[PDB]
Design a protein around this ligand. Structure first.
Ligand SMILES: *[C@@H]1O[C@H](CO)[C@@H](O[C@@H]2O[C@H](CO)[C@@H](O)[C@H](O)[C@H]2NC(C)=O)[C@H](O)[C@H]1NC(C)=O
Ligand SMILES: *[C@@H]1O[C@H](CO)[C@@H](O)[C@H](O)[C@H]1NC(C)=O
Ligand SMILES: *[C@@H]1O[C@H](CO)[C@@H](O)[C@H](O)[C@H]1NC(C)=O
Ligand SMILES: *[C@@H]1O[C@H](CO)[C@@H](O)[C@H](O)[C@H]1NC(C)=O
Ligand SMILES: *[C@@H]1O[C@H](CO)[C@@H](O)[C@H](O)[C@H]1NC(C)=O
Ligand SMILES: *[C@@H]1O[C@H](CO)[C@@H](O)[C@H](O)[C@H]1NC(C)=O
Ligand SMILES: *[C@@H]1O[C@H](CO)[C@@H](O)[C@H](O)[C@H]1NC(C)=O
Ligand SMILES: *[C@@H]1O[C@H](CO)[C@@H](O)[C@H](O)[C@H]1NC(C)=O
Lengths: 230, 274, 347, 99, 49
């Protein structure tokens, strides 16, 4: 079931790996525009996807990406469990409605096949809100994440937070669409989806080197004046 | 770069001339008198404060309260860019100002044309009133009222200066302009000017000597153009600064060392002293 | 000129020379899969070109010369002889077979059938083009038709675009065929710069830590010189570099041990010479502008303008003769003396 | 002194190469074919144009100051010589009599 | 007179070639290849600057 809500000032990450402090920097990249619709669910990839959730029972785990969703094309199938994380690019045969049986993978896919990538490490997961940003650029797959406590709220919290880079996967394949992955008996889930656009931002670093504020140079004339005056 | 000529000598000559002229401006404006006069220990002048403008011995830097307020309110190693210190420190300029104040209080306008001659302050004020078309008995019969008016007027000045936040914009524009010019010159070093990179070390450590010249010459031309623009802007600003300093020197000579009759030159109204 | 009058002149500058050199190639040694790229005896057609990614290994290029006397050995963005000293993000290797006469068609900003219908090469390419003959290996006596190339396509190809959709023409290779038609093996390498910390770089060896001294440093390709000093910067666990308002390097972390090391330029400044007229004497004094006296007449005096060498500081007062700095002048009284200028006579 | 220095610098700038094979037009003309001469000629043209522009800008800046000084001298001639002045220190030190 | 003359000269200067094939960007771009168009554009850019 679809819905709509307001993004507010959420979805700011670290563009690169250079330390700065007590400076104002202008960055041009793909970001989530301030005060925009984000769809609430209970899905094209485009140029980027913003994922946020606050569910606790861990029914949500991993995601599925692909263009045609068939064994003829490679497809990312991230699997998150209690101990590790499984990253595969193998051209699995995509079942129509994947889901974890809990732990047979037959319902997710029918067979495994030719591929070269594999990655196992600590799982991405760990009143709690989670944010994720996905983008596929220049032959690289980059994922950002951040965790923060939240009070009881039906919408995104007011305030500011920065997302730190987690992994940079050198995959470089064709992605056009994506779906979520769930583990299950009937049930329900809640999550939000946002889309990135090419924008120009004005990031602010404190004396300790952490981002605390930003301005979007295309929201309104006041922001444009702020960006021009730096 | 040696093949381009002798632009650097011209730039150095221009900058050195600017610096020398900057020293000469202050030397001409402030060094008007040759003797260092002093005020008497007893500060009685017929009922007039001068404490708000006379130097304060309690503080170490020996400055008047108004000078302290002005000093606090104004507020404020690169790649081949340096800043030189002025020849005259702040204490010497303060001493010049104090000597001028002591001379004009204890002597009138006589010390600006010869030896300093003593005169009581009310008689000097009577002379100044006589100089605008008012007789002496007007002053001599209203000494207390005029003294109180002068005291209140001098008292309100510090509050008027402090309350207004943009009273000293003229003295802040100079600092802002210099900072902007230097920052732009520094930031211009990161431009490519249509080359593979903006770092000479990377080009030298990646390509062969026969080929790096094509990339190096573009950087040379761009940086030379930037330096020329900076120097031209500096000269244009220095001319206006010199004109302002000349006006200030003329005002110091005419309004402080004497009484002026030019309208709206030393304030609005009939001039008395400065 | 042969005569110098009284005054102060700024002649030249000075700088502190480096002491030694420091290199920090981290630890790891591997061998890149360059053998599998070559001599594979199976090279795909130009219309379906192989694409391999090379990373996390030490690239050695002497084997490239050891392989064969290549007909073509050309690099565009880099000097070919300096490939043994560079560190790269990743290397993309394209291997296929094209005709001998069409080797010149593989170049940025070039037009040709294979250029616009088989392999579009962008204008901002950074890599090398290498081709060598394969007549004795890929020329059947009756004709090797396994190689096909596209001939008809509605639109020109995009950079790094592969199509797999009769437009296809089968190549014919025979030993009797002369130069310009025998098959040539072409390998195209693409390079990436200014990205995540480079990993394909291992030909040299490292050194140790030195601090509080002007020494050359090379931290995984970050060339330059300066002084390495302990830093109190709270780096987050994923940055590597540091910058400032001027957009220049000021901090770095050692690859071996996670430690923040500040970097500052070595000492430098201007030099001024204070002399009276040559008609009077030949004694001179030297002023180092904005430099502490420790870094540099047997008499040394410290002023706000810098370190003064060759003049004696007397505690009298005279009218200024040669301006120096903040209230300090110099005069030839016979020797050179430095004093504080006097404003005037007390009265 | 300033005029002499400016003229000397302008005439000395003619011997620079500006990244060309030679600094003489006749030598390049007699040695290289016309299809190749333009590449070398352009650099010399640009350098000499830059030198001329710099000279003209400096001359304008100096002329402005000379004009200001001339205006001051004219005012002094009108006020100290054709009359008696009461402005302090304008017509010398002391009480002015004549000039 | 000075203001009008300065504006007229600045507008008139746009038709110079500065040592290029032509004084119009479109004809340089269409007729030539990008590797040489990116060289021909620089002369015009520098002259106008
Ligand atoms: C000149 O004015 C000052 C300031 O009003 C007078 O000094 C004040 O004197 C009173 C009474 O002793 C103190 O309460 C104030 O604190 C003083 N002001 C300051 C700023 O300290 C001074 O008395 C006046 N001159 C004469 C001769 O009376
Ligand atoms: C979101 O979309 C709806 C329609 O899809 C539109 O009416 C609305 O203005 C958009 N923005 C917000 C903040 O709801
Ligand atoms: C969780 O995933 C890891 C990674 O494959 C696997 O080794 C482990 O057995 C899994 N845990 C369970 C309980 O299946
Ligand atoms: C995978 O790709 C290779 C390469 O063409 C092919 O031989 C193979 O049949 C494909 N499928 C599997 C399951 O390996
Ligand atoms: C990726 O998938 C889209 C959607 O089917 C397709 O149009 C495109 O050709 C594919 N390849 C690339 C390189 O985009
Ligand atoms: C950075 O460090 C300083 C001093 O240790 C501290 O006061 C400040 O709160 C820190 N910044 C943070 C924690 O964001
Ligand atoms: C010069 O270095 C010495 C050495 O400690 C120091 O005491 C002195 O303050 C320094 N001078 C300046 C101007 O920093
Ligand atoms: C100069 O002034 C007095 C001389 O009595 C002395 O206190 C001071 O130290 C002298 N300065 C020197 C000797 O450098």
């Amino acid at each position: 079931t679809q819905s709509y809500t307001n993004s507010f000032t959420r979805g700011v990450y670290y563009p690169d790996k250079v330390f700065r402090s007590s400076v104002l920097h202008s960055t041009q990249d793909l970001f989530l525009p301030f005060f925009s619709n984000v769809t609430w669910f209970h899905l094209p990839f485009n140029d980027g996807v913003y994922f946020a959730s606050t569910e606790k029972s861990n029914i949500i785990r991993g995601w599925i990406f692909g263009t045609t969703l068939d064994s003829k094309t490679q497809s990312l199938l991230i699997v998150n469990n209690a101990t590790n994380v499984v990253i595969k690019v193998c051209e699995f045969q995509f079942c129509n409605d994947p889901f974890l049986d809990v732990e047979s993978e037959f319902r997710v896919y029918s067979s495994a096949n030719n591929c070269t990538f594999e990655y196992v490490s600590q799982p991405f997961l760990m009143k709690n809100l989670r944010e994720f940003v996905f983008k596929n650029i220049d032959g690289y797959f980059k994922i950002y994440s951040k965790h923060t406590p939240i009070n009881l709220e039906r919408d995104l919290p007011q305030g500011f937070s920065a997302l730190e880079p987690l992994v940079d996967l050198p995959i470089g394949i064709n992605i056009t669409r994506f779906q979520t992955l769930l583990a299950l008996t009937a049930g329900a889930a809640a999550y939000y989806v946002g889309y990135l656009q090419p924008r120009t931002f004005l990031l602010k670093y404190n004396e300790n080197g952490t981002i605390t504020d930003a301005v979007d140079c295309a929201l309104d004339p006041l922001s444009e004046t702020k960006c021009t005056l730096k | 770069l040696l093949q381009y000529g002798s632009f650097c000598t011209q730039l150095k000559r221009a900058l050195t001339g600017i610096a020398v002229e900057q020293d000469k401006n202050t030397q001409e404006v402030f060094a008007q008198v040759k003797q260092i006069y002093k005020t008497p220990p007893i500060k009685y002048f017929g009922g007039f404060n001068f404490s708000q403008i006379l130097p304060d011995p309690s503080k170490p830097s020996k400055r008047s309260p108004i000078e302290d307020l002005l000093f606090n309110k104004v507020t404020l190693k690169f790649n081949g860019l340096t800043v030189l210190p002025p020849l005259l420190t702040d204490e010497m300029i303060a001493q010049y100002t104090s000597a001028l104040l002591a001379g004009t209080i204890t002597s009138g306008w006589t010390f600006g044309a010869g030896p300093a001659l003593q005169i009581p302050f009310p008689m000097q004020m009577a002379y100044r009133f006589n100089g605008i078309g008012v007789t002496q008995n007007v002053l001599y019969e209203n000494q207390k009222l005029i003294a109180n008016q002068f005291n209140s007027a001098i008292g309100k000045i510090q509050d008027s200066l402090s309350s207004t936040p943009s009273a000293l914009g003229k003295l802040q524009d100079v600092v802002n302009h210099n900072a902007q010019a230097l920052n732009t010159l520094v930031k211009q070093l990161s431009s490519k000017f249509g080359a593979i990179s903006s770092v000479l070390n990377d080009i030298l450590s990646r390509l062969d000597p026969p080929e790096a010249e094509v990339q190096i010459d573009r950087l040379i031309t761009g940086r030379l153009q930037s330096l020329q623009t900076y120097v031209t802007q500096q000269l244009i600003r220095a001319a206006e600064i010199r004109a302002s300093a000349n006006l200030a020197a003329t005002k110091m000579s005419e309004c402080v060392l004497g009484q002026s009759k030019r309208v709206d030159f030393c304030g609005k109204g009939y001039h008395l002293m400065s | 000129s042969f005569t110098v009058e009284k005054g102060i002149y700024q002649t030249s500058n000075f700088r502190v020379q480096p002491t030694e050199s420091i290199v920090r190639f981290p630890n790891i040694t591997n061998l890149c899969p360059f053998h599998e790229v070559f001599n594979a005896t199976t090279f795909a057609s130009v219309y379906a070109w192989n694409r391999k990614r090379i990373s996390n290994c030490v690239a050695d290029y002497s084997v490239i010369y050891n392989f064969a006397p290549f007909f073509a050995f050309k690099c565009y963005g880099v000097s070919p002889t300096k490939l043994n000293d560079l560190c790269f993000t990743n290397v993309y290797a394209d291997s296929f077979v094209i005709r001998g006469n069409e080797v010149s068609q593989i170049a940025p900003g070039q037009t040709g059938n294979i250029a616009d219908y088989n392999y579009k090469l962008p204008d901002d390419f950074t890599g090398c083009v290498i081709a060598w003959n394969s007549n004795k290996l890929d020329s059947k006596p009756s004709g090797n038709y396994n190689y096909l190339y596209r001939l008809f396509r509605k639109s020109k190809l995009k950079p790094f675009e592969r199509d797999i959709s009769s437009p296809l023409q089968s190549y014919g290779f025979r030993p009797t065929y002369g130069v310009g038609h025998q098959p040539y093996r072409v390998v195209v390498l693409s390079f990436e710069l200014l990205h995540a910390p480079a990993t394909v770089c291992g030909p040299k060896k490292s050194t140790n830590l030195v601090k509080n001294k002007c020494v050359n440093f090379n931290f995984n390709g970050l060339t330059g010189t300066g002084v390495l000093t302990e830093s109190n910067k709270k780096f987050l666990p994923f940055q590597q570099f540091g910058r400032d308002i001027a957009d220049t390097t000021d901090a770095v972390r050692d690859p071996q041990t996670l430690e923040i090391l500040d970097i500052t330029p070595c000492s430098f400044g201007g030099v001024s010479v204070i002399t009276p007229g040559t008609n009077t004497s030949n004694q001179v004094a030297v002023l180092y502008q904005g430099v502490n006296c420790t870094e540099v007449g047997s008499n040394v005096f410290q002023t706000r303008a810098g370190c003064l060498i060759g003049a004696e500081y007397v505690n009298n007062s005279y009218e200024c003769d040669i301006p120096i700095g903040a209230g300090i002048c110099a005069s030839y009284q016979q020797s050179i003396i430095a004093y504080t200028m006097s404003l005037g006579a007390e009265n």
